[PDB]
Amino acid sequence: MISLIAALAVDRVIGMENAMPWNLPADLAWFKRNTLDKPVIMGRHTWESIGRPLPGRKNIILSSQPGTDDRVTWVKSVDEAIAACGDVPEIMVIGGGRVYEQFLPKAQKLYLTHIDAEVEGDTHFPDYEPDDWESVFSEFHDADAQNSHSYCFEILERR
Ligand SMILES: Nc1nc(=O)c2c([nH]1)NC[C@H](CCc1ccc(C(=O)N[C@@H](CCC(=O)O)C(=O)O)cc1)C2
């Protein structure tokens, strides 16, 4: 099945690491445990800002142009992207904005981190109709030593 994973600030705003003002190791830990050993699909900008392939995951990059790095798999369409995953139980889509928009209608689960930090940004996570999803898990954490902001993890599933 297809699953989306994103970190959202107030107002579902999303942005690249360096663009984001918060510092949450715990969220990274979470992102990591939910992605390990699964194929990860991301848009070219996200790939470029990540800067190296995610270890322990098959990395598939979406780009309308030919690939420029042999350490990852390059694809040219959403359909080709899903096909390159093979038969796996769950495919994780990691952004960006444009990739989220494209895969949402096809997703069955959403792993979201809600961050309490109002930031002025460019992109918003796509709007998901409250009617189609059911929250199946949540967990709040306040800020701390390591974590700069209070955050809440949540998993939703398509009803
Ligand atoms: N939950 C969540 N948090 C985020 O910050 C992001 C999302 N999702 N999804 C989209 C996007 C992807 C950006 C992104 C993804 C991974 C790493 C990363 O380094 N992952 C390492 C974590 C290293 C560590 O343990 O901190 C990894 O191996 O997964 C950095 C930025 C940023």
Side-chain angles (χ1 to χ4, degrees):
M1 96 224 340
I2 294 168
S3 284
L4 271 53
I5 177 166
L8 276 41
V10 166
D11 281 326
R12 305 203 267 81
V13 162
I14 51 171
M16 308 185 177
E17 192 86 342
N18 289 178
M20 319 326 282
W22 65 73
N23 202 276
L24 308 173
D27 180 45
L28 286 177
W30 158 268
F31 168 95
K32 169 165 144 146
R33 83 167 155 285
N34 280 305
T35 61
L36 217 36
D37 303 321
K38 310 186 176 167
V40 294
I41 294 170
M42 65 184 97
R44 178 193 50 101
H45 300 299
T46 292
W47 161 233
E48 291 188 353
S49 69
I50 278 181
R52 49 61 184 261
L54 291 179
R57 284 150 282 188
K58 173 189 203 155
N59 295 227
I60 295 161
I61 322 308
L62 222 21
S63 172
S64 57
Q65 302 300 105
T68 57
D69 184 322
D70 283 336
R71 284 170 311 163
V72 299
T73 294
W74 291 86
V75 301
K76 301 181 165 77
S77 71
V78 163
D79 278 337
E80 215 194 327
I82 285 147
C85 292
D87 268 58
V88 298
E90 184 182 17
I91 288 162
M92 308 296 304
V93 178
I94 74 185
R98 185 176 162 200
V99 172
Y100 291 135
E101 259 167 15
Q102 273 168 115
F103 282 90
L104 186 77
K106 294 177 148 78
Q108 274 292 318
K109 199 153 184 179
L110 301 175
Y111 295 74
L112 305 187
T113 297
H114 305 272
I115 312 182
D116 194 57
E118 180 180 0
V119 272
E120 180 180 0
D122 53 40
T123 13
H124 294 231
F125 186 70
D127 170 42
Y128 48 102
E129 148 156 322
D131 203 315
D132 308 329
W133 300 84
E134 188 199 338
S135 171
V136 302
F137 167 85
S138 211
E139 170 183 297
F140 182 71
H141 301 273
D142 206 336
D144 69 16
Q146 295 184 80
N147 301 287
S148 87
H149 301 56
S150 65
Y151 53 96
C152 189
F153 293 129
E154 169 173 45
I155 292 171
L156 297 103
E157 301 173 351
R158 175 95 71 163
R159 43 160 104 286

